[PDB]
Every structure is written in C-alpha cells, then in structure tokens.
Amino acid sequence: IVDQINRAVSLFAASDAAQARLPVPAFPVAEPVEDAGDLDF
Amino acid sequence: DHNDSIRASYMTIEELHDAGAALSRDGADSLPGFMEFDFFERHRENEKEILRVYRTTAVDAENGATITPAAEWLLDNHYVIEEAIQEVRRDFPRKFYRQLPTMTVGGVTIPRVMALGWLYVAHTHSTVSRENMTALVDGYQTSQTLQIGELWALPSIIRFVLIENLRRISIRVERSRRMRQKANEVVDEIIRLNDAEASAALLKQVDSLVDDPTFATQFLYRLRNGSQTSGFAVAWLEERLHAAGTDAENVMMSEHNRLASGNVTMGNIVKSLREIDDTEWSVWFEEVSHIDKVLREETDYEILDFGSRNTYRNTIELLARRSPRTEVEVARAAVEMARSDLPAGADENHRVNVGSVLVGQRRFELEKALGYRPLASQHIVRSMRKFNWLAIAAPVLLITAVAMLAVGWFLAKAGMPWYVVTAFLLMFALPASEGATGLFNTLVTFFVKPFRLVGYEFKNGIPEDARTLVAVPCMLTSRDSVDEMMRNIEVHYLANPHGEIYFSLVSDWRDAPYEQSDEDLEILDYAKRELAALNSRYAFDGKTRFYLLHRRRIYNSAEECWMGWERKRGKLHELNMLLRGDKDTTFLGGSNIVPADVKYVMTLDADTRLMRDAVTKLVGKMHHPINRPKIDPVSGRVVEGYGLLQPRVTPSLTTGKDASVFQRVFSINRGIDPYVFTVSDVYQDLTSEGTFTGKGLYDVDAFEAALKGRIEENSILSHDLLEGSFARCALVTDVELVEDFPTRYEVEVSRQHRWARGDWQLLPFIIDRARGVTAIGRWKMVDNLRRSLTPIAWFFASILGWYFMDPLGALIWQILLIFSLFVAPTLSLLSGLVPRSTDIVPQAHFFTIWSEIRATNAQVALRIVFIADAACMMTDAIVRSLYRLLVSHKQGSIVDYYRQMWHAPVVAMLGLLFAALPGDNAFLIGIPFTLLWVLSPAVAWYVSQSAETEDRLFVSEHVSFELRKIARRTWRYYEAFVTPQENHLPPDNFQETPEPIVASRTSPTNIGVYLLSVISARQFGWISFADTLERIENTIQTVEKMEKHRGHLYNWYHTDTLQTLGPRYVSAVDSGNLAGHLIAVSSACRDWAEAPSAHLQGNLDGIGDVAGILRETLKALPDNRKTLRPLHRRLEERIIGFSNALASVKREHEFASIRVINLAVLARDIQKLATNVDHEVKSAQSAEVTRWAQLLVESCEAHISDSAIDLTNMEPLRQRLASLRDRSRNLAFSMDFTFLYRKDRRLLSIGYRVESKELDEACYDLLASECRLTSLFAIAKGDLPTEHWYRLGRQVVPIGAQGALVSWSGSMFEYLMPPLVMQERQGGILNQTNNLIVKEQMNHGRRLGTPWGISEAAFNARDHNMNYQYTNFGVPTLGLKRGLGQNAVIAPYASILASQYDPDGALENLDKLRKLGALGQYGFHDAVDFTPTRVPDGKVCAVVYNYYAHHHGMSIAAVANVAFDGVLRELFHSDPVIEAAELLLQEKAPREVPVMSAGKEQADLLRAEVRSIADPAVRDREVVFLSNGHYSTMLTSTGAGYSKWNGQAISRWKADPTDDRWGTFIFLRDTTNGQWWSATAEPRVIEGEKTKTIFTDDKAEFHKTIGDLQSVVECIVATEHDAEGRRITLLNVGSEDRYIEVTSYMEPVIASEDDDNAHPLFSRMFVQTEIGRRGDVIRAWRNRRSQNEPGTVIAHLAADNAGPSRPTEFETDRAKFIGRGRSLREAAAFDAGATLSSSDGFTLDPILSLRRTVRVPAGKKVSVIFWTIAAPSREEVDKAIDRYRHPDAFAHELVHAWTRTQVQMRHVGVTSQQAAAFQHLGRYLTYPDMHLRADSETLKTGLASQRALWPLAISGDFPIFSLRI
C-alpha cells in the first residue's frame, strides 16, 4: 500500500497533443432559411 | 524454517539433559551447520558483514522501500549487536583459546565448550535461558565434569554462535530483498513493452537468477494477479518450474516459510543477547560448577567474599593445570590437608579453614606434596622475596651506578685535579635514583601480579565478637564548627550503618600555657548537649553510637603547652588503655563512657570521607584467621599476620567552590575508577609490608603491646610510620578513602614542612642497630630522606655547575638534568601506551595524549620555579630538626607572600653574582634561571587564586541582569496560576491563542519544580518572607491531603477535585524527583531556620530587575500621538530617577528605612503616571507596563514589610520553620522504592500498576537520564545495593576530539535535570559530557542554521480539543533512536537550562530567539518549529503558543544557580545522607574507553509533497479532494469537479472519461480584442497558454501565462462555515492598460446525486433562485414539497476587490447562456452582444453566473474572490455572506483551513506521501478509468452482479475496493 499506486501510475502513463492548441473553430451563423411553398403549416 | 540458519528441530525440556548425557559418551557425529574455519578470521568476517549490511540498510529504507520484519531488529537494536561483537575477540587471546582441550568433531579439531554450545541454539528455538542451559550442563557433566575456565566462557561462545547465525540470516534476507526488487524491475520492464520477442530475450538474460526460490514469489504473483498480465512469461516460468521436479505449489509454499522463520530467529537472537547481557553469571557459576559442590561443605568457602573465591578458583586451576592432576582431586587433597592442620580457632570450631594451604603459609608444602612445577616467574619472585630488601635496592643501585659512570665519562673533559667529580656525582645522582625507582615500579606493575588480601563477606553487618570504634582525633576549639564536626560524625555513621560499630570523638583543646581556662567546660557543655540531641535522633535498641572523650592538658615541658602525656599519639594510647579498662586515665568524668568490648579501632580523619561499605570489608579481612597477628613471644614484631591495615587514598576532583589550577597540577589521578580493583604496590607485591600514614583500623591487644613495649618518649607526627616499624602494616589497595587537596600554596608548604620535620629525628633509629626496627623500615626512612633532600641537591649541583667552569658545554648540562625530572612522571604514562604486546587488535580507543603532556609540562614548570622555595624550606626544616634533639637543646596579597618567603630572590641573586664573576661567561645561562626563580611568588599567588568552576563563572553584570529580568518575567506563570482555590498547584499546560483554558492536571515533578522555584524567587528578593511561608504551608497541606500508595504518587492528579484522571499508575521517576526536591527544600528551610536573623533583610535586587523590565518595555511604546510625547519623557525621567535612587540606596550599607519609604513613594508615583498615560492611550500594550509597575510597587511593599519585622518575638516563626522542615523530611523519607525493585535484572521498573498489583515491563538502563537523580535517592534511602548504579548506562560515543555519554533521544534535559539539583565537579565525566553536549548542540544548530534548543516541547500540530500535543525530541547524532532529524523543533527554555556552562552563547541564542515572536505575556513561549511539513505559507518558522510549569521551574532553577553560583546544589547537598551518597559520584574520567562506531542534515528534515502537473492537457488527469467535515468538493487538473454537502451535492457532475467538462469554471474575456478563454485549461484553451497546476494540501493552484498576462486561481475551502472560495488574480507585465472581464459558471443541483441523475427534469424544476437588494449575491433553494426535506439554501457571490463600484451582471437561464445548439466549449454568451440580460425567477434550467468588467492597470495586479455558501436554512446564510462580504477575508480563514487540514491529517496515521497515494487511488476509484482492474480473461467470465448480494453487499453505489490476504 502507498507504493503500488505510485508504481501503477508510472507504468500506466505515456499522440493526442496537436489537438490542444487548435482551440475551437468559432461558431457558424446561417442566413436564415428560405420559406418555400407546399407546406400546410 | 531452514534458510541458512542453524536449526536442529526442538528438544523442549528434559530432553536436553539426556541429550547432553549421550553427547558425553557418544558425541561428534554431525552438526546442523558447522564447517572448518578459523575463529579470528570468522569473527573478522562477521564484523565486516555486519558493517556492510548495516551501512546498506542505513543508505536504504530511507529513500523509500519495503522493510522485512527481520530487518528493523538489526536497525533499531544495532547497539546491542555492536556491543555483542565485542567481549568476544577481547576475552580470547592466542593463549586462552589454545590451552583448553578439543573433541575433534567430524575430523577437524574442535574445542569442547563451543561444540556443546553449538547445539544449545540448534536444538532450541534460538532463545537462551538459564534453566535449559543449566540442564544441558548437568546432563553433560553426568559422566565427565568440566574444568575451571571451561565453564566460565559459555556466554562468550554462545554470543559468538548467535552473531554468526545473525550474520547468516542478515545476508540471506539482504539477498532475498535484492532478488525481490530485481524481479519487480524485470516484470515492470516486461509489462511496459507490449512486444513478445523482447520478452524472450529478457527471460534468457535473467535465467541465471530464477533457480533461487525468492525470485518467482513476487514474479508469479504479479503475473497472475495484476492489471494487464501476460500469456508468454507464465508459459515459460510454469514450464521451467515444472521441470527439474519443482512444480509451483512447492514454490508457493516456500515463501510461507523462510520469512516468518527469519523474523522469529532474529527476534530470538535479540532476546538471547539481552538475556546474556543482563543476567549475572557468578551465582550461576557457583550453583553449576561441580568444584563448588565440594567446597560448599565442611568449610566456610560459601561465605568468603567473591574476590577471595575467585582467587581460590584461580589457584586451584593453576595447580590442576601444570601439575598432572584433575581439579576435583586437587580440591579434595587440599581439603584433606586443611583438615589435617588442626582447627586451632575459637570461632572455627566448625567448618575447615582452607586458605592456609591455598593462599596461606603452606602453599609450598601443598605444591611439593602434589607434584607442582612452579613457573620461572614464580621462581624469580620467590627468590627475590627470599633476598629481602636487597633485591629491592639492587636495580636502583645498579641504575644509579650506570648513571654516574655515564655522566662521569661524558663529563671527563673538564680539567680540575679530579677532587670534586666524585662528590659532585654522589650529591647529584638523586634524580637518577628517582628515575630508577620509577622504572622499577613500572616494570613490577607491568609484570608482577598485584597482591590482594582475603576476608569475609558480612552480608548481615558486623557480627558479635567484632566491635569497631571509629575515633576522629581533633580539637574542640570550635564555637560554631562543632556543628560541622557532629555532621561529619553523622555522615561517617551513615556510610556504614549496619553492624556493631560505634563512633566517638576525642578532643584536646588547642595549646594553652596554663592548665584550664575554667570556661571551656561550658564550651564543651553545648557539645555534650548537641551530641545528646544527636542521640535523640539515633537511639536504636537502647544503643548509643556516639561518644565524646576529652583530655585534661597535663604539663610536660614547654612549647606545645600542656598536651597531657604526648600529642595525638598519647591520646590514642590513652584511649587504648581506657578501652580495656583504666579508671585513673587522664580524661574527664561524664564523657568517659566506653562501649565494652570494642577490640578494634578505626582512626579515619577529619576531612576524609568514608566510602560506602568500606570498613565492613576491612573488618572481614582483619577478622580472617590468615590475616590475624600471632604476637611473636621473643619480640613484639609479629613475624606473620597483619596488625595494621592501610587502604589506598586518592584525592578528590575538587574541594567544592575551591578549585584552582594548582589543584590540576600536582595531582592528576583524581577520583575513583570502578574498572580497577587492585593497584600494584612495589612494597607489598615484593616485600608484603606497607607504610602507615595514620588512617587505618587496628586491634587492641597486639597493637598496644607492640606500641607500649618499645616507645619511651619523643614521638612526633612521623611516629605513625614508626608504628609500621613495630607491626606489619598492609596496604589494602582495594578500598578507596577520598581526601581533599588544599588549594592555597601556603598550606602545601606547611604540610611539606610538617612531613619533613618528623623524618630527621629517626637518625638514631637508623644508625644504631639497637632498639627495634624492620629491615625494610630503614630503607623507608632512607627513601624519605632522599625525597626530602632532592631539591637542595639539585640547587647545589646546578649552582656549582655554573660556578666552576660553565664555559660553553655546561649549557648542554643544564639541558640534561631538567630532562631527568621529565623522566619521573612520564614513565607512568608508559603503562598507558603498551597494548599488552599487541595481543589483539584494539578498537577506536583515542589517544588524548596532549592533555597529560600539558599536565606534565605544567607540573615540571611549577617544580622548577619552586625549586628555590622548596630548597629553602627543606634547609630550614632540617636545621630546625637537628638543632632540636641533636645539640641537646629540645590568605593575603602578593606582598604577604613576598614578606613570608623573602628567601629565593636574595639567595638566587647572591649565587648568580658569586658565580658570574669568575670566568665572566656563566651569566648567559644563569640569568634565565635566576629571573624565573625571583618571580616565583608571583606565579605562586597567580596559581593560588581560585579559577572558574562549575558554579562561579565570569558572567560580568549585564548578562546576569538580563538573566534575572528574564526570570522575573517568566515567574509570571507561578504568580498568576497559583491560587487559594483548593489547588495550590501550577497547571501543567496553559494555552493562550485557542480560547485559552487552564489545565487541571498536576504531576509530582511539577510540584517539586514549583517548590524549588518558590525558594529561588524568595532568594531573589521578589516576595515577602510571610508570603513564602504561606505558599509553603499551602503546598505542604495540599501534598499531605493527597492520595498516596505506600508514600508514592499516581503521577497525574486533578487540581480542583484532587482526584486521579485515569488509571492510578505510579511513576517511579516522578516520585524520586519530588523526594529530592522536598529534601532540598527542607534543608534550605533548616538553613534559614537555624539563624532567622539576617535572612529577614532581603536581597534588594529584584526591584532593580523589575525596574529594568519597565525600562525595556517602555521602549516598545508606540508614542506617535498628536500631542508629541510629553508623558513619554516624563515617565523616562521618573524611571531613571528611581533607578538612581535605588542605586544610591544599595550603595548605602546601613539600609535606612526612610530611603525605602521614599522608594515606595517614587514607585507609586510612577504607577500613577503609568495609569494616567494608559487610560489616555487605548492600547493593548500599555496594560503590560501598568501591571508591571503595579507588581513593582507590591515588590517594594513586600520589601518594606520584610524590613519591618520585630526581630524579637521570633520563636513562633522558628518553631514553625522547624515543624515544616521535619514534616518535609519525613514526607521525603517516607518513600518506599523497595517494592519497585525487580530482582531479576536489577535496575528499576518504569512504574507500578494498582490493577492486579503488577510491575511495569521495561526498565531504565542508562546513566544519561533524569532517572539518575532518582537513583541517588534509591541509594540515599539505602533501599538498593551499590551494583545497581554500576550495572547500567556508561556508554561512550565518539564526537569531536573526545567521547560523550550516549543518551536515548539525546536532548539536553537528560544532561541538565540531574546537575540542576545536585553538585558536579569539573574533573568528572559528567561535567565534561555536559560541556560536550552543549558544544555539539551549538554545532548542530549552526549546521542547520536555526538556533539550537532541541528538547521536550510541543510540535506545531493540532487535534480535536486543541492541546498542541507533547513528545520528546533529540539529535540523531547522540540519540540512538531513528526518527530525530525529521522534526527540528527548537525550544527556547533549553538555552536557559544550558546556561551553567556557557552563559554568553546562551544569551546570544536567547537574543536571536527574541528577534522573532517567541515572547508572550507569561515570559517565553513553549517552542518554535522549523519543520517545513508544519509551517504555513512563506514563513520561516512558527512559534508554538504553550506555557508549561516544569519548563519555567527549570529555567528559574538554572538562572538562580547561574546568578547565585549554584546555591541549589549547595542547599540540596546540605543533608548528611547526600554527602554519604556523594562518594558514589565523583568517579574518574577515562579517556581510554573502547569508543564505538557511527548538507545532509538540511535534507534530513521531513518535507511536504508538492504534486505539480507540468501541462494538464496532454498528460493523464489529476484530481484532488477537499473536505470541511460536512462539505466536500472535487478539483481536477483541468478545473472540473463537483461540490457535495452532507451526502447531497451542489454542482452537477458526471464521470465522463472523454468529456470531463463539469464543474465551476472561470472565463476571461478581452474587450478590445474580443477573444475569450478560461482561467483553467479545458474548454477554450487559446494558443500559447503556458499553464501549470499545483495540488498541495488544503489549497489548489492553477497558474497560466498567455503572454503579457498572468492569471492564477487559488481554490480553497472555508472553515466552520461550509463554503468554498476561488481567488482569481490577474497581473500585467507590459506597460499598457488592458480591459478584461471575468465570468463564473456553475449549475446548482441540490440533490443526493442519484435523484438528479434519475429524473433530471424534476431537479431542474424544483429550484427557486433570485437576486436580492445590492445585487452581488445570488441565492437558491428547492421549493418546499413535503415536511421532510432540509432545503439547503445555497448562494454565490463575487466579492469584487481592487476596483470601483460597478453593477454586476447575472443570468440564471442556461437556455440564454448556451444558445440552443451549442456546448460549453463554444457558448453564445461570449459573442458580440446578448450580455446577460439578467433574467431571474423559476428558470427551467437554472445556473449561477456573475460577470464583472475589471480594468487591470499596467504593472500591478487585481484579485477577485468568488465565494459559494451552503447552509441548512436561510436564516443563517446572512451571517456567512456578511462574513465574506467584508474586504480581504481571504486570510484568517486560510490559516484556519490549514490548521484544520492538519487536524484531519493527524487524526489518522497518514503521511503526505500516503495522502498523495490515497488521492491517486481515488482518481481510479471515482473515474471509470480502470488502469488497475482485473485481467481481461478473468473479467470475461464473471461479474454477474446479482451474485454479489449473497455476501450482504449492496453493490448499488459502491466502487468496491478488493483486497486479498
């Protein structure tokens, strides 16, 4: 106890690195939608 | 159960007997272990292995590793093994190991004893025991008996075998541990790489280390039971173990043994070593050896003293060895020979006297009747004994003749007609003779065995038909020192109380020309009354043990006035006639009573102190028939026997307060050496006669006859030696009689003159063959004559040498004779350098040669500068001694010495002038000697002055003043915590910060230290006499009205109720300490009660100390008011005027009352001014000044009251003091330690238990503890024997250039508590060790940087019901206890206590402590802690706020001893029992003991674990828990987590391994740029963002730099409020103003987790949140549904700081926060608009949000403290919010949080590393990340869930931590 947990943590450590600096690609806003015909409501 | 040990099953009991019996006739065969080896080589290998794997164990086990249970036995008990490896190889030279026979077991030559001992450990459980081994010895001796010496060395060989087995086990366990760690490394490497080809390579590489059983135990378990497992390593390992017929179950059972067996064997070895060490062997040897069976019948050998029994055994062994005969038949023949010699004895009607043929005068007859071959050395000794005194003088004369021949041949080139050379050589060769005698003494000591006498062993005291009178010959010209004389008599009686012994004092007052002054009788009357009082104190069985005799001063001739018949010789003769009955003696009526028989008289002396049980040993030796004089009928000479005994006398170290450097010059060997028993005497080992100096016991009949029949008249001080000429004086050289050495040089000159006066009237006794004198006696007088004439001969030889020629070459001459003196003492040191012809290899025994080299140089210098004075004194002495009875005639200054001597300078100048005229070349050598000689009185006065001692120190006055004022400040504890509330006892503990409470527990040590502190304070002049007596009354009444167990105390007691807290456990040490303190207090009470006249004035010094205290405290007044400081300089002028007035008063020696009245007026005026300035300045510090002035004016009032005593009606006071003295002494002596004595291992039990009436298990075995003080009482009371003192402790450890006493947990109080009470001496080992301890403590403090003071204290750590705890501390260098360097706790009181040896350094350390906040209202605090693990923020050290009673008492005692030159050590020693037991002290420092063997100190201290994550984005996630006892929260490395309060949670959180986006979040948005990101690193994470995360205890830190900006987040949990806080701090770098906005996000969910996770919409709907007036706190709480929900109102606030007053921005609608189609990773709230329209109410998706725009300036920092609160109801959230709405408020709660986290940490046995490991376990226990779960194949056919309910496990909300034992 208190030695197995440390040993397991080091053995279970170490490609997902370039995905951190990309941040978020803002957001998308559309120009509404065309209200075509042929619809009851 | 095998390993590499020596195991031979187990024989239990009654099988050992017949086993050894079979071994006797049929042995050898085979042994469990055993092989051919060399004993010395094997022992060296064992020692090397122990050092190797002890250094290995030291360098390991501290870096962090598992330790087997068989390893810590070698670690913690290394002193036992390092002492056990000794003795062996020290008791076995190359001769003792060869003379014993051998059994040749197995073909190899094997001695019998260790062959037998081999099976003792083999056939048993490796545990030694007396009964089993005695049974084995008896069984072996059933057929063939053992021999003397063979039976002796059983423990040694047993220890050798035991340490060999220990080495085997140690190396085996080291190898097993190394294999285990290697297997762990290999399996970790295998599991790290998923490939399979490399696994085969690794297996084929490690195949060389698989056959060992201790490699697959961890390996196979790790493969089978792990996380990832394998399928290829097992396929190889199982096949390999199945091959070679080994399988796997055998391996899996192998580790079940060989480890528990190892632990059991190691523990058994340790216990066996302890049992061998502590248990005795003399009684075992007596009860086991078959030789003693023969000699325990028909003879008194069973009671003949242990040493004489040893001599008998040694003689028997020597006779049996050389002579071809067995020892049993030799003993039988000796017994028959003794029987055939007739009884011839009064008391010897029964038994048989056996010594007459063994050590008697029939040794030669037995050796010739048995066929013994004497040794060549024995032949030489016998021949030279037959050659009488001629053989004594032959080497001396031969060496002198060689010396004169050599000097004559060397000085054969001088000229002159050769008429002076012969006389010159004859008068010169005195120092050559002295050197020859010294060389002869050295040779005989090195070769000739010292002679020891034989005597009885009076275990029951002196029996009937043996009565001894101890008579001290002195005078009663003592108006006051008659009390000293009776005290000396009482001490002498207390030395040897048991037996039929009586004590008498004989007197003859001064020397007056008349007969009687007709007044001395009344002067005697007081004496005859005083002794009568002593009789009332000692009258047992109607027996009077005290007598007085007085002479009548009959006129004889002249000069000496009227001495009766003669001097003290005549007095002793008159006593001799009186004892046998003489009615007409020249004595006085009334005081002429003799106690009947008393056939034996002891003389002793005035200043000599009688050693414990000394004369009792002398009485037996005298009474033994061998040592009984027979009175030769032809002449009163006594051919054989001894009528005079003289024990050796060695000077004491010091003489109390009189200890000058002159003492440490003319006497080096000072004290008693327990190691040595017999000192080789040339005159006794070769001639069997000694010189009687007048201090010894003697008979009456033979002594009286031989003294009366030969002496006519003319006897002087030398007659004592003449007595040896008429008897046979034997030097015992076995019993010590200490004697003080005078310090003044004048006293030494007077004593030398007196000794030399008597040595020159014996010339008729030498030159005349008539009268009667021993043949060697003439040689004794010749030796005395030459020893007296040496200085005159030296002076004459030197002056004539530079008078005749002295051209050049005689210069070399003045170099040679001065070398001769150098020969005289240094040859003695030759006995200390020869290692007995390098028989063995010594250990680190040091050299210390410089000390005695410097001592010899100083002695030679003093001798050469006093040559002229000694020559003048001897010349005048011999002239007087011849002019009388040969011509028929019959303190101060340097000016005093000059006028007294007036001889050496004038004579030296005359000689120099007379010699320098002829030749005119003899001045170049004469001038230095003459100038050195004329200055002799100057160096004489310089050396006669007393130097600095253990009591008197050069402390100047400023240091003393500072110590006195510190003590006065400290005494506030006793002043304010002793009350007449039925307590009268100081509380043990006092808190002052954490709501201070007064403790209600008191210990006897506390009572004693309080009592002695009261005595010291009264001596200081701080309180009135009446107050002191009242306090003594209260303390004594409380003590007597207290529960006791056979006088003892139950340690802890209540104060208000005076009951026992817990079990009534008696403490042995505390009772002894209290008894010693009570003894000292009673002695002091008697001291001021015998004359209560001058003690009533007062010291008149304490008021000056408190005035100085006021002066110092006034400098701390912050006088910076609007009206300047007028009152300040008013007050200072008043105080300096008061100081001047008191200085003038104390300058006056008449002590005018009007002066002290005016002083009181000034004091009260100063108090009024202080009150005036205080009530105007509302400060918390001026109250201290005002109360100090008030206490000052009570002190002045008390001094006035003590100055107003009537001094007339003092009898009630005197009788009260007498009654208190008697009651205190009776209470102290009512102690009973006898029932606490363990008569199995000696020593003392730790305590007694009132439950089952059982003793404690442990004992005290160290001479470096306070128990020593108790031991003194244990000997003072007389309830313990003397060997108990010598059978414990006395261990030395190397450090520096010397060795120090080893102490368990080596703090300073172990070395300071004893000397605080009784008196030590400079020459003792105790004072030297204390000085060392101080020096090394300062060195350790310097190395650690922090000031020293490591002692008993309270480490800065709390617990429930705050008490700061209490434990022991020490230094690892001198502690013998692992775990001392990890604390580094500094206690200021240790510096005060260690002030008796270095006041300046102690004061400097105290000032260094004063530079920090180590001072409080009640003087100094408890201690200060420097341990990083117990220090908050960036502070360097933390001061523990405790006050202790015993610490303050120790400080007061130490300062009183320093200021008053150890007054306590004197008053404690003012009891006769203390002087009786003091000779057990004194001892002798050794400098030759077998010393043992041993920036790292800075790193040795415990350091807290700082878990820091470099980049919490690409590494594995890290989590941390925070708790408040009722409120818990989760913080992840990315900033996620939750918040739980009493089961139910607050913030929603789900365990998503891939998302991890739940919790309270902080967002930072730029205004101009429009960019936004997060304070943590998860949702946004813009480019750059150099971030880091710190998870330490209590607080959590998230730091992030984005370039030009640094943002830090501090997450904390509140104390006693159930709140959480987040400090966001933004600091700029560039010089540009920037706009930023903060946002807080958290979703409130008040539910028990499952309820929200089941149907979230209910939890969303049942939330009512709103914003109140002055909007910055948003509150929320569930709407009331039923009558059973709590409600748990929560709230969130921003608490803006470092900014203007601006409105907040809130939004409680997540629909308008997210954007209906987005996530937290991209929210619509950070767009260009829709900025928190502030909608509140019953929102379907309630959240808590707070926005504030903050303008961070250029260069500085801005912080905002977000807070969240949860409370059971709404009526109490207001006080929590207002508690945090106050500015700052981040401190105060922070330190409280740290303290409570420490409380929680220490409430369980958890370490910081253990806490980190537990959090790492929790990260897997909570998150469904399973990196340590079961195997994939194992988990693929199990986990049916419903089956877990059979074990009564809920398995609903349970991570289920499994563990397999």
Ligand SMILES: O=c1ccn([C@@H]2O[C@H](COP(=O)(O)OP(=O)(O)O[C@H]3O[C@H](CO)[C@@H](O)[C@H](O)[C@H]3O)[C@@H](O)[C@H]2O)c(=O)[nH]1
């Ligand atoms: O303070 C002291 C103590 C002792 N002596 C001795 O007194 C003697 C000097 O006296 P001196 O001038 O010789 O005359 P007396 O007094 O006749 O001589 C005696 O002086 C002492 C008797 O009182 C003893 O020492 C001796 O019996 C003897 O010398 C010397 O022996 C000194 O040691 C002093 O002078 N001063």
Ligand SMILES: O=c1ccn([C@@H]2O[C@H](COP(=O)(O)OP(=O)(O)O[C@H]3O[C@H](CO)[C@@H](O)[C@H](O)[C@H]3O)[C@@H](O)[C@H]2O)c(=O)[nH]1
């Ligand atoms: O200032 C002086 C003068 C003399 N003496 C002593 O007095 C004696 C001198 O007398 P002296 O005529 O030289 O006779 P001595 O042959 O020395 O014999 C003396 O011895 C006794 C012991 O002091 C003296 O008292 C007697 O006068 C005398 O018999 C010597 O002992 C000197 O030590 C002093 O101590 N101090």
